[PDB]
Symmetry: C5
Subunit: 338 residues, 5 copies
């Protein structure tokens, strides 16, 4: 994503006036193809009408242009497009919050799994690596950036997210469905094995660890649900037919007619319709935002930084349960004692 | 459902332009009947007006067409239809999330119910089969696809979801209401019987299993509530009268009149109203999406894949508590040790 | 409620076309009075204008009709009415989900309260009867159907929901406020008395039972809040003044004037305004849905089936803690063993 | 609040027609001042125009009235006002549900704090009085009705909500901020002191009591947040400038011009603009509802009955933990035994 | 923020009429620059047109002004701007509720961590200082006011929020990412160290403290998510291009033309367009509210008072676990005893 929050804290004058001077993740980069196609088609029809057509053929084109200008308002562009964009934005922010963060499981495993020797160290690192793997295996199914980072499971083995013994156990488990739920069972079995060996003191701490595991499992299930149940295809087809049909009508209807014929409405000849191009800018770019945000896990400039987030979660998770287990600062008095 | 999420990750040019070349679950398959009925009625009235009516009768039809063109805008089509479609889409996504997933109960039963012999194996499989049966018995009441897969309870017995002794116990329980709550009591009684025999260690683990049982029971209750309390019938009647009355008016009002009579507005004769057919496309198809999604558990192309989900839940549930109980990979060091 | 979900699973052709042939809970049954009053007033003014008024008086009525037709669009009908109907529908579905279901408490009491003799049987039945009574005493305060089923507390005694000793204890408790919270204290005291006698094993199971009791108490409190804090009366007055003032203006403005006077707009005389009657149909019926759903606990055709739900909850609750305590089917192998 | 829910259960004919015959909490009581000011200003300008101005001055007033009638539609009244009213209603119902109800803490304290002697009786009453005081001290900060009931802390002492020793301890605690969090710490300390003396059996019951304490603390924190973070003042200024500027324009633009001058639009002279007064009624009263509901804790007719609710909570809380501790009815058989 | 809730409790007459006489946090302070730029540009173009241009050049400017007045309505200002402002307000109130409040952790630590000597006092103060530091370290990353209060970590050391030993431990932990999660691991490790020394009695109280820690960690994670995932930049660019392009068109289109030329629409010459300036006021100020509230953690007049809240949380947290540990008032009888 493009983050500009620190630039818009106060509202002086050019709070939004400077942000339109940015190229990375802009409206200009999105509309740079469709806008130039629209410019090319409009100026092509304009030059053909001004330089090629005969007089009766121009007189027929005038009636066609008046018909298309009168009756292009029957197409419900804003009515369909606002509803579709509201769906896309609602599902967008709903899909951000479904991304699993390891930090609650991190806080519980960093303190409740005892042992300062190598066995408890290995145990805590294996628990957090299972919690991260149960996230990576669903993020490589819902995202294309993670899938291009990890094309096969051997790339998950080489990155250190999975040992080859876990790869052999993962391949030996026979299931035709998506196997993202495999480490979230290994986590619970390893937590119970840790409790039975005395590394976890009581049942309440074990049940807290398992509750946070099931919370992360619900997060991964929400990601699977938002990826599998898309926006219905019939909505996408209706909105693209709406925008493309409206501006296909505006290719003919918004053409500058002859001022010497003295039509009502077409009195000035400017050869560049500023308001038609602005209306195409707002409607077509308003559709392009929904095209960008309908899948926020791809490789757009404003899709989610999933690979960075995987690297952060792996580093922070393996940091807080290895170096920070019983490594506390010295309990000292504050500036407010007596 | 038709899933196209992997095709719309990035937004290059034809992100939505290729998706209108798809037939399965499209606007075209929905409107293929109503659109051709509208085309047939319009061209029938057009040919009758052009070839059959006498001159005074055509002059009366002209006044009828001008009246219907002037006063068809009084019908609040968009105002009623947007509100109705917003209800349908909100209830649609609310009904997806109410579908019970066994995975939290799966994670707890796979680890907390002890025993590697045949008795604990039978116990875990019976617990997960009760948790799946308490979902199947409500999905065959809210869906028509599951009801056509399982027409009677004997088909539930033959699929392995229920043993015949459980069928006899299920028939001996006398209740005139829906019996989907029967396995969700058997689960709690079998969990307490498992705790009393020592298969579950403490009370906290038992209460966690019962809390996830009650969570799945709340999911099934939400499905029962959304199926039983429909959208009010008066809304459905008002929206279908709105769309059908508006286009019944547009059968007469949008007719191309005679250009030689020189009416204001009807100057060009094209014999095919492109914008009337587009307006019928958007409004009527916008109603057809609500017709499709008012019950997302039927057998439309974009209703929910409930039978696939039942098969997945049964296979994954009986997999993770039988093969994956204490079958863990070897605890080995990572690529980040020292 | 009228349930039609099983009829609209697929979307073939007449998915909504058959549902307008139904009378029970329709738009026709709602508007059958107001629509005929509007028809009567319009045709009365029409016949008086056509047969009674003199020429200068008709000429004054023409100017009054043109004024009322020009200036009835200043009344914000859709703007106020859409906001009001959105409130009514949001509160409608929010009030359905606040109805207490005994099933979570049923699942916990059916398994955690021990004893196969008559004392534990009496104990479980008394606990579930308290949980049902704490729901009946708020449903007879928020609904008129339950209040007509149970006019006094003696009718609650005769139905078996309350023994006469509990009636005497309920009357001896002195409080000027609504006493729906009385059985939800008796439940907690009886659960603690059951724990102290050894019928409940540990504290965790008791706390789970009390947590589900407090969940049902929050459900009853939400019902009390939605009944006591209505939609503000000023909104109801503004919407009824809006609809009635707009169609009081349309009684005069939509009248067919004389075509021989040649007014702009009034050229055709049909004597039955189809689009005025349709506009009255949609706006007035859109108000009548809000009139129906502003209190969904009354005795409309599409209000909630509260009495049926009370009977179901009583039967299922006293069934699952009496016959189904330790009555489990035989643990047998599945079709997938080895 | 004005409650009319029992009057609108069914929808016969006059379901909303009788509710406009009510004065308490009506649109008429709100608009009785602003409407008469608008009537006075309009009729003043009308009589001055009809009786005082000369002919050229009337001819200038005609052009001013046509300008103001043509260009008053540029003011976005409905666009700003609908958004503002939606915020006010959303925050209104969000602030009702944040009002703390003592009933969950009541159910736990009435059963889990042991002792039938005077010490446990005093202990339970002191716990519930702390839970009520932690609500009263935030309701006298967010409401003006509670602040006029309790102007100082001595009025809280005289009402029995606080003993004078608790008043001295409350004054000895030095903090420049709002002290509504003081009894919600006393509750937890007294619950731990009750557990350490054996009045509470185990830790799980104590943690349940503390969890419901923190739930009530979150309710009080939501009330503090909704009172402290208002709707932004810039929205309130924009909506009042919108409504007042639009009807300041309509004082001149809606004036009946001279019919003998024969302007397009002003042909009939009625001297009382019915639709202008109706439009002022709906827009200005639609603003007055937001003025009423922007602070629903004041002393309007449809603000919340906070003092009644404080009296109810105090009476019910001190009732259910004193008289109803181990005072249960006799366990007797039902009408459905065998 | 500017709080005016106590001024708008009742609705008499001038409930909103007095609030437009306030300068701090008003629409006037926001629009004081852009409005004067618009006034300057409009009056500059007006004086140039009235005093400088020749007759044919004025005749060309008339056609340009009629074109820009006819075709500036094609720009979807309200359609884009309402959607954007709805996003800004929804995210605004969603970001207020994500601010962590220490009070639940305060209530649990003030009672469950035993010890009246200096060691338990130091232990409770260190726990609450960790809970406050885990909030300060994310509020100095999401806000500019806290970042200007604490430019470096030495300023956090000097304020008493962090001892220098904790500063050395905080710098020794090597991580390239944001370190706001560091004290929320120290809290859990210190709570487990407090439990193992006997300062916390059982496991249930420890798990309650850790659950409230993870709740505060989820609050800080929501703040990090709302700061990192902004509103998409393409929406901000489209709305600022919409407002600026519409009023750039209105600089030419709303100009008062010559009345002697007798154009339809431009008949009166007033030299100050009141309704154009009002329309600029509402649209441009409606954009400026979104500019103010897109980052509510900056230093605007109506952004959140974050520094005051940090000071309050520090004072109240270190107050309630030091002075109020076992300092209870005397248990005395109420006014309602017998
Ligand atoms: Ca994307
Ligand atoms: Ca369907
Ligand atoms: Ca009703
Ligand atoms: Ca108020
Ligand atoms: Ca700001």
């Amino acid at each position: 994503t493009v983050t500009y929050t620190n630039r818009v804290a106060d509202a002086r004058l050019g709070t939004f006036s400077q942000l339109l001077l940015q190229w990375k993740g802009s409206i200009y980069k999105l509309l740079y193809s469709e806008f130039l196609i629209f410019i090319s088609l409009y100026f092509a029809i304009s030059l053909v009408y001004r330089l090629i057509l005969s007089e009766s053929q121009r007189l027929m084109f005038e009636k066609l242009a008046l018909y298309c200008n009168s009756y292009a308002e029957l197409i419900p562009v804003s009515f369909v497009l606002g509803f579709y964009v509201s769906l896309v934005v609602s599902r967008w922010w709903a899909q951000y919050e479904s991304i699993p963060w390891p930090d609650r499981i991190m806080n519980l495993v960093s303190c409740n799994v005892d042992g300062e020797d190598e066995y408890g160290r290995l145990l805590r690192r294996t628990l957090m690596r299972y919690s991260n793997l149960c996230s990576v295996l669903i993020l490589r199914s819902v995202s294309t950036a993670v899938y291009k980072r990890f094309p096969s499971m051997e790339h998950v083995v080489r990155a250190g997210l999975m040992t080859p013994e876990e790869h052999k156990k993962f391949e030996s488990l026979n299931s035709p469905h998506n196997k993202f739920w495999i480490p979230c069972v290994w986590f619970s079995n390893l937590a119970v094995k840790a409790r039975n060996e005395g590394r976890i003191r009581d049942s309440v701490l074990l049940q807290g660890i398992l509750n946070e595991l099931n919370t992360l499992r619900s997060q991964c299930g929400r990601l699977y649900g938002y990826d599998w149940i898309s926006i219905p295809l019939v909505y996408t087809q209706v909105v693209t037919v709406a925008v493309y049909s409206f501006f296909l009508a505006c290719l003919i209807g918004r053409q500058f007619l002859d001022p010497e014929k003295a039509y009502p409405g077409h009195e000035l000849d400017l050869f560049v319709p500023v308001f038609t191009f602005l209306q195409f800018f707002f409607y077509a770019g308003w559709l392009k935002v929904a095209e960008q945000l309908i899948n926020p896990f791809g490789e757009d400039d404003d899709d989610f930084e999933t690979n960075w987030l995987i690297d952060r979660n792996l580093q922070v998770s393996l940091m807080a349960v290895d170096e920070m287990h019983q490594d506390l600062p010295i309990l000292e008095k504050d500036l407010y004692w007596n």
